[PDB]
Design an enzyme around this catalytic site. Structure first.
Site, PDB file in Angstrom:
ATOM      1  N   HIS A 152      -3.134   4.456   3.564  1.00  0.00           N
ATOM      2  CA  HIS A 152      -3.637   5.098   2.335  1.00  0.00           C
ATOM      3  C   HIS A 152      -4.942   4.951   1.860  1.00  0.00           C
ATOM      4  O   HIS A 152      -5.495   3.657   2.225  1.00  0.00           O
ATOM      5  CB  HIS A 152      -2.536   4.941   1.224  1.00  0.00           C
ATOM      6  CG  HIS A 152      -2.316   3.570   0.804  1.00  0.00           C
ATOM      7  ND1 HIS A 152      -2.706   2.247   1.719  1.00  0.00           N
ATOM      8  CD2 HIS A 152      -2.334   2.971  -0.367  1.00  0.00           C
ATOM      9  CE1 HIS A 152      -2.659   1.376   1.280  1.00  0.00           C
ATOM     10  NE2 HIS A 152      -2.459   1.619  -0.227  1.00  0.00           N
ATOM     11  N   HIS A 153      -5.450   5.594   1.012  1.00  0.00           N
ATOM     12  CA  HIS A 153      -6.645   5.086   0.305  1.00  0.00           C
ATOM     13  C   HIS A 153      -6.665   4.374  -0.851  1.00  0.00           C
ATOM     14  O   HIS A 153      -6.702   4.833  -2.099  1.00  0.00           O
ATOM     15  CB  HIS A 153      -7.613   6.278   0.185  1.00  0.00           C
ATOM     16  CG  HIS A 153      -8.933   6.090  -0.237  1.00  0.00           C
ATOM     17  ND1 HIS A 153     -10.162   6.085   0.839  1.00  0.00           N
ATOM     18  CD2 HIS A 153      -9.581   5.844  -1.522  1.00  0.00           C
ATOM     19  CE1 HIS A 153     -11.147   5.917   0.084  1.00  0.00           C
ATOM     20  NE2 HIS A 153     -10.904   5.583  -1.249  1.00  0.00           N
ATOM     21  N   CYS A 154      -6.394   3.188  -0.893  1.00  0.00           N
ATOM     22  CA  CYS A 154      -6.173   2.286  -2.145  1.00  0.00           C
ATOM     23  C   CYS A 154      -7.432   1.880  -2.747  1.00  0.00           C
ATOM     24  O   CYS A 154      -8.263   1.343  -2.449  1.00  0.00           O
ATOM     25  CB  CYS A 154      -5.462   1.002  -1.583  1.00  0.00           C
ATOM     26  SG  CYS A 154      -5.348  -0.256  -3.040  1.00  0.00           S
ATOM     27  N   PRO A 155      -7.625   2.427  -3.951  1.00  0.00           N
ATOM     28  CA  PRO A 155      -8.883   2.298  -4.554  1.00  0.00           C
ATOM     29  C   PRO A 155      -9.207   0.981  -5.276  1.00  0.00           C
ATOM     30  O   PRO A 155     -10.156   0.358  -5.457  1.00  0.00           O
ATOM     31  CB  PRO A 155      -8.935   3.525  -5.802  1.00  0.00           C
ATOM     32  CG  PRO A 155      -7.429   3.548  -6.019  1.00  0.00           C
ATOM     33  CD  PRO A 155      -6.750   3.355  -4.816  1.00  0.00           C
TER      34      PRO A 155
ATOM     35  N   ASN B  46     -11.461   0.596  -0.393  1.00  0.00           N
ATOM     36  CA  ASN B  46     -11.846   0.952   0.937  1.00  0.00           C
ATOM     37  C   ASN B  46     -10.476   1.386   1.139  1.00  0.00           C
ATOM     38  O   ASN B  46      -9.237   1.043   0.862  1.00  0.00           O
ATOM     39  CB  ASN B  46     -12.163  -0.432   1.542  1.00  0.00           C
ATOM     40  CG  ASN B  46     -12.686  -0.066   2.863  1.00  0.00           C
ATOM     41  OD1 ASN B  46     -12.455  -0.790   3.968  1.00  0.00           O
ATOM     42  ND2 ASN B  46     -13.223   1.332   3.204  1.00  0.00           N
TER      43      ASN B  46
END
Ligand SMILES: CCCCCCCCCCCC(=O)OC[C@H](COP(=O)([O-])O)OC(=O)CCCCCCCCCCC
Ligand SMILES: *C(=O)CCCCCCCCCCCCCCC
Ligand SMILES: *C(=O)CCCCCCCCCCCCCCC
Ligand SMILES: *C(=O)CCCCCCCCCCCCCCC
Ligand SMILES: [Zn+2]
Ligand SMILES: [Zn+2]
Lengths: 295, 124
Positions: A159-162, A166
């Protein structure tokens, strides 16, 4: 001046400290996470560890500093590092792949969109279907996916964990899991010891005067309460995806956890070997050299 | 040198999700090099990449030794996978300069193409 391979590398990433870093563009919440962690730990180390060291065992601040240094090292390694990005196809290789695709497709019915380009493989006595990526011009390797924000196919995408700033793929998932775990431990620790400090100091001075001394205690109590209420649930979710050897991107799709429950071919039928392979196994290096020298 | 066509040795996921290259023989490679040395080269690369991703005792010990230092030891020490990619690169360049360049062929390192294929370039 030399032309490094990151200023030309396509995608929506950012590169600082000369190229030795790789983060998303929307790194707004990363600064917030960093500031929250550093501020809460400094408030602790400056207003409660002093007292709990002078008037208790001197191991409390040292152990808290060990946990905090571990958490910081793993967070910085999760954010700064390269999540396992796959390089785009060169023009000739992409042309060759698409040629094979059109040759195998044959005559397409008119007015109908051609069927999705799907390749089927046999992984561990299981039918696994890859999918074409019309941007990278490759076939996504197994477990890979496409981050619509960063715009580059991450390998073993999660997932694109903000909050870490990154993506989270293959090369930096052990560090992300260890950062989450150490942050949950550090939060439980700071919370328990702040409660201990308040109790031990109110037994001597009282409640109102203790509160009027430093509001940092209630600030840290609120911060740690909410941070626990989120991060503990998160780490409970991840300790069951690092054991069955799955990825958040697959659990969202409900592939192995649904009506079929058929074996995920990438597993091992155990929990110990899975934990070892995902956490302590060997990881590939950066497959796209960024500090390389272009002509 | 001019190019006459490119073939690619696709990756093989049959045994698992670990780097292992297929052993099929290309049709265009016929009459250009005997299948024995090609099969050997692919087998040696497969064995090297197996030594790379080989689980067991050494890998887990090194992982735990790194976790004991908050993963700050990878700033100075070269990991196992790179310590075998070096051997892979050396073997590929020596095998190229030995047997592949005379026949008019080129073998590229798979770490360039993203560990996905082997770009064999056929010249004329
Ligand atoms: C509370 C503070 C604790 C500090 C503990 C010390 C270590 C903290 C983390 C340092 C940064 C780090 O490890 O980043 C590793 C990644 C590697 O990227 P890649 O080579 O895998 O693509 O990115 C880099 O290689 C980063 C390059 C820039 C940093 C270089 C190392 C600095 C170490 C600390 C110096 C004081
Ligand atoms: C490149 O784009 C860098 C911007 C992202 C944040 C930069 C700062 C990273 C954190 C470094 C400070 C932590 C060390 C704490 C020392 C005690
Ligand atoms: C790009 O901006 C790279 C930044 C890397 C930041 C690393 C954080 C510094 C850590 C300091 C090491 C310990 C000294 C501080 C007092 C204990
Ligand atoms: C493989 O190489 C590593 C296996 C995973 C390690 C699990 C770490 C457990 C918690 C780490 C936090 C330690 C903080 C220091 C004080 C207890
Ligand atoms: Zn893509
Ligand atoms: Zn992204």
């Amino acid at each position: 001046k030399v032309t490094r391979k990151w200023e030309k590398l396509p995608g929506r990433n950012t590169f600082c400290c000369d190229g030795r870093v790789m983060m998303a563009r929307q790194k707004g919440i990363f600064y917030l996470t960093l500031f929250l962690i550093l501020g809460t730990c400094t408030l602790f180390f400056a207003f409660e560890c002093r007292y709990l060291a002078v008037q208790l065992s001197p191991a409390i601040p040292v152990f808290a500093a060990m946990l905090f240094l571990f958490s910081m090292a793993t967070l910085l390694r999760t954010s700064f590092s390269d999540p396992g990005v796959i390089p785009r196809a060169l023009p000739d290789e992409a042309a060759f792949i698409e040629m094979e695709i059109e040759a195998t497709n044959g005559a397409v019915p008119q007015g109908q969109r051609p069927p999705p380009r799907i390749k089927n493989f046999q992984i561990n006595n299981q039918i696994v279907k890859l999918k074409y990526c019309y941007t990278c011009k490759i076939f996504r390797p197994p477990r890979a996916s496409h981050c619509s924000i960063c715009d580059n196919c991450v390998e073993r995408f999660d997932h694109h964990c903000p909050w870490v700033g990154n993506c989270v793929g293959k090369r930096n998932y052990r560090y992300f899991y260890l950062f989450i775990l150490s942050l949950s431990l550090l939060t439980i620790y700071v919370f328990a010891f702040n409660i201990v400090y308040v109790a031990l100091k109110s037994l001597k001075i009282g409640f109102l005067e203790t509160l009027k001394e430093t509001p940092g205690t209630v600030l840290e109590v609120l911060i740690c309460f909410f941070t626990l209420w989120s991060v503990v649930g998160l780490t409970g979710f991840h300790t069951f995806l690092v054991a069955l050897n799955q990825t958040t991107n697959e659990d969202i799709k409900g592939s192995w956890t649904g009506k079929n429950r058929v074996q995920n071919p990438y597993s091992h039928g155990n929990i110990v070997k899975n934990c070892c392979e995902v956490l302590c196994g060997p990881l590939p290096p950066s497959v796209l050299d960024r500090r390389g020298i272009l002509p | 040198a001019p190019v006459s066509g490119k073939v690619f040795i696709q990756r093989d996921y049959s045994s698992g999700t670990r780097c292992q290259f297929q052993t099929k023989f290309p049709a265009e490679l016929e009459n250009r090099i005997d299948r024995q040395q090609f099969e050997e080269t692919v087998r040696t690369l497969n064995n090297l990449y197996a030594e790379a991703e080989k689980l067991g005792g050494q890998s887990y010990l090194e992982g735990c030794l790194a976790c004991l230092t908050a993963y700050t030891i990878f700033l100075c020490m070269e990991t196992h996978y790179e310590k075998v990619l070096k051997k892979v690169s050396k073997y590929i360049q020596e095998q190229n300069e030995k047997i592949y360049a005379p026949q008019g062929l080129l073998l590229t390192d798979p770490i360039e193409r993203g560990l996905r294929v082997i770009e064999i370039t056929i010249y004329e």
